[PDB]
Symmetry: none
Subunit: 248 residues, 6 copies
């Protein structure tokens, strides 16, 4: 039945790390369009949506829509041991109860094959937000990551404030008060009005692992609405996170 | 009221690590001479004196003598997140209760500002020891650091013995007995008589973080007197530690 | 009166790490032939035999056969602090109760000397039951090490299966099932018949630290018999491990 | 909608201490039968099974089988602060993501309520065993506890030897050799063959905290098979541990 | 010059523990009214005011107002070694630089005398924040102490909420969320309106050692104002703490 | 062939604690007179002499003089686990590398047997001191113990001054200056002239554990000579310590 082979296992390694940060199990919705994972954290505050378009793979075959529930904790453990530069083929057979991962060297002198039992995961229900986003900032993904790590020395909450001149990340706590201001000028603001929301750093931190997938990152906001943080996986996919604003 | 800007935040980062090893809070005596910290460990066995002369800073302004008590634990946490190669401006205002640290990139596209609450710390009450050291050894700071780490596998006490031919560090314990002998030159002994004292490795270890500030380190001894370990910060300051001998 | 000087302390450092993985104390049998260590794990399932031929040392002197029991935990701690590229002289004197390690820089500007108390160790029973190894595989030592680390995500047991055309390492557990197949050449199989044994990963893992001593590693098998894993120390010695199969 | 109220929080306090000794997280299988916990240590050598029958509780309500994963480290911390003689109600609501603990005084003048986040814990494969047991010894639980603490001065392994006349616990090590012999007929041996097995004291020690639940303790053995140590929680449940012998 | 003798040294022992929790040195204002200490923590968030009226002592004499700075750390160390049921006479002389503590047995067969050096302690910064306290709760001092210890398992901040029916202490953190609700009577609420403030547990904890001085404790609150926690020392003095709310 | 059985193991427990405070190994000189231990601290400043007369034991048998070297650290560990109120039989056999300790219940329902390996310990130089003691003070042993613990808050040295009216213990240091004066009777001074010596509290502290053996303790002094501190063990033995003065 299903077969999806990527050339460089890095991609899967880096992806699973990202999504496993948020949830331990997830359904892999596989279509002829490609693989998607959509999942919420157990507190129903944050959502991941990842899509790997079929052009992502050097070989992709998915006639009908199959759905594969997996333990991301186990999957993460197996992927930890796969070499970055080896190929990796995900394969599931008609009514099999197991998915198989197959890695091979460029030189074809080593072949690894792993098998994971599937789960039993109930359909998500709570869906993507339907926004229309007034503001947008795009910045270096690793700067973003650093900023959220940094803001965590102060508090558990970051306030992001977008203005014509740039974006200001702010946090408070016992240690003191911090901010990092990035100037527009590199940081591409493009907003229709000044806007200022707050968020849980716990989740922003989980999101910021996306920096392993994309040199840049885009944040999208809308007053009193879940923000989005998007990491393009070149032209062959995305990783997208949504997070509820804090209280207020 | 105070403004002290260094070009490279590294300096502050490395300093605070050193002094935070010994004490959690300290008063920064700030004069038109520059910043000084003088402080004892809670066991009253060891003393730090640090001075950053005003020529240390690319910009320095301190009309009246203010004293700023700080939590070095918090300060350390904030400095951990400042980029080494960014600038860093320490500033305190007349009516304030807070000191502010302001970092900027070389490119001026990112500005960070942190604020720490001040403390009322009781003014040290313990004077620098009497000088006139009949003995001096100077050595590579990182060798010194390694030696004290090493001597700790044996005991909690190191015996330093200076002779015309060099210096011998010795320790004992369950594991066994060790020594490291460094021969004169590269090791600049310059002494008036052979002399042999013992010291707590706990503190020698704390002092040895000074190796981050200065390629070389000077130890000065005097029979029955606190030794000194000095790290020059170029020509623009020093870091100086004093420690009681072990007698018994 | 024993003296054994190696030019580069690395060797001793890397060796003691390897054997200390298996046992905490061991007798160093010293002859004019060189040093040997032979020891079993406390469960009597696995055996180490190390030999450093006298050509191994830049200086070797052992008139009569002495035996020196040592605490490898202590020895490991002392060797951790000796620089890799320093020389290292092991010396024991006529009924002394202490062995001494002496390190010197290439430049002779630093000299270190450590002393360990000897033990009292009873000579072990098992004594290498050996030979008649029907099958043999040789492979890159670091690949081997990686494979055993990897197989540990699945189980506590690895099944090694040698066939003309390569070796297959397999494991099972909660996470799932995995294998790594290496194809023959690079992997030098040389066997008289297909053969398939199982082993405790705990011990294979301990053995795999041998990769620090030798770019390649040889495994030797024999139906219903302890396997051997051998790491050559470049013509001048070996490190050799033997391990009971799992049978049922 | 789950509810389980015990009259005296002591029970929960003492139980969680016992099981937290072995594992940091565990699933609470809750049925109309009552609560059960079944879990292995991370080395897969030892198994706990606890059952609190529904008659254990002054109020019990569990329509369907729910499973609640918990951090026993956190749960232990919360239970440390609950008064022994207060009541304690464990409550979970439909898709709540949190369990709540509610304590009340006998006099209803003080009410405490705590909330713990649940975990997704993967269901444990290893299923007790089906088993006979040829031998049986029952003894004062606190004597047993003391004996295992004692045997730990000698070694990491205890040898239990059952004979018609009593049971002999034995251990060895650097310190020397010890034994404690308890005579039958107070010690209820009841066996169909003499036998002698060995076990890890680390785990026997963990098990022996059961003495807080039950004045007596029963050990059951079977040649070459996991022993069992059982603590009856009066008539309203049990705590049961299984441990692999040391073999060879 | 000063003489103040208490019959039972317990009092001093218990007091110094309490105040030493907050500050390491303090000025003892000594008048013919009695001894008073008024002192702030280094963060200027918390104030202690202690008064021991002259009727507190079996013998009291202080013609002029002297001020004695003392090291409470040293004083604490000396008081640790004074027997609870011995008498204790504090004495300072005209020309002295030292205060002396003199202990004697009931039977006059043992006499101890200790001498502490005085300090020049600068800050008289202070300022009791007297105000209209709208709300008042009085409760068993040891329950209060337990509650703050308990709330610390969750967070570093407690929210106290006074209502007609009682007072609710609440905290949050990694471990979870907790509360303790005490119902009105035994717990004597007496308030003019419902009121809800937050406070640092670090300081509430320091204050709660007051339970050694007084079976009951009174807390007084006022919207946007420092709370007060008061421990009466019989009829012969008080210990009173004031603490800034957490606002943000 | 030696056998020495005491009725209550307490005695051995309390003794070994006392002497293990000073040294880690010691020879047990066993004669028909009884058991004696004599040992010096490794700094050759302090000496223990213990004697248990043969009437001490409910059963004692020692035809010839045997000497048993023991590790007091191990012995202490074994004795920690022996019940106070059990009997304890020490037994050594003709040409046996091991001594055996055998404990039994009053009720004979439990028997424990431990075996320690002996050591070859070289006879020390260690001559008991010569003199006839000019001064003598006898006091409650636990008061003495408390006094030395107390004097340690000040210094590492205590000055004991005997006069017609009583004895004065004095110490100095960073914390301050202390004394305890005990008045003559209850404290039995009996001296031929006033005399004032100083001693290391480290050792006085070690000695003061003798209070577990004897309600009273006697100190004996002689100008410029080792003091003695003696603890009678009923009428059936003594424990005696000697310590060099500090000369200044």
């Amino acid at each position: 039945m299903l077969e999806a082979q990527v050339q460089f296992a890095s991609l899967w390694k880096r992806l699973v790390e990202c999504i496993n940060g948020l949830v331990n199990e997830a359904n892999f919705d596989c279509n002829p369009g490609g693989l998607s994972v959509q999942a919420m954290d157990s507190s129903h505050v944050a959502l991941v949506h990842m899509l790997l378009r079929d052009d992502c793979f050097v070989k992709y075959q998915c006639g009908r829509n199959s759905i594969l529930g997996l333990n991301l904790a186990s999957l993460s453990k197996v992927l930890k041991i796969v070499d970055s530069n080896d190929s990796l083929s995900l394969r599931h057979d008609d009514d099999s109860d197991v998915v198989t991962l197959t890695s091979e060297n460029p030189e074809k002198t080593r072949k690894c094959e792993y098998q994971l039992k599937l789960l039993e995961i109930e359909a998500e229900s709570m869906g993507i937000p339907e926004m229309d986003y007034r503001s947008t900032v795009t910045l270096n993904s690793a700067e973003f990551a650093k900023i959220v790590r940094d803001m965590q020395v102060f508090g558990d909450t970051v306030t992001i404030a977008i203005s014509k001149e740039g974006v200001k990340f702010s946090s408070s706590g016992d240690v003191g008060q911090g901010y990092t201001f990035l100037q527009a000028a590199g940081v591409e603001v493009t907003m229709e009005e000044p806007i200022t929301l707050s968020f849980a750093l716990r989740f922003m931190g989980i999101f910021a692992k996306g920096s392993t997938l994309s040199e840049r990152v885009t944040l999208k906001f809308a007053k009193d609405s879940p923000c989005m943080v998007e990491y393009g996986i070149d032209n062959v996919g995305y990783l997208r996170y949504y997070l509820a604003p804090k209280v207020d």
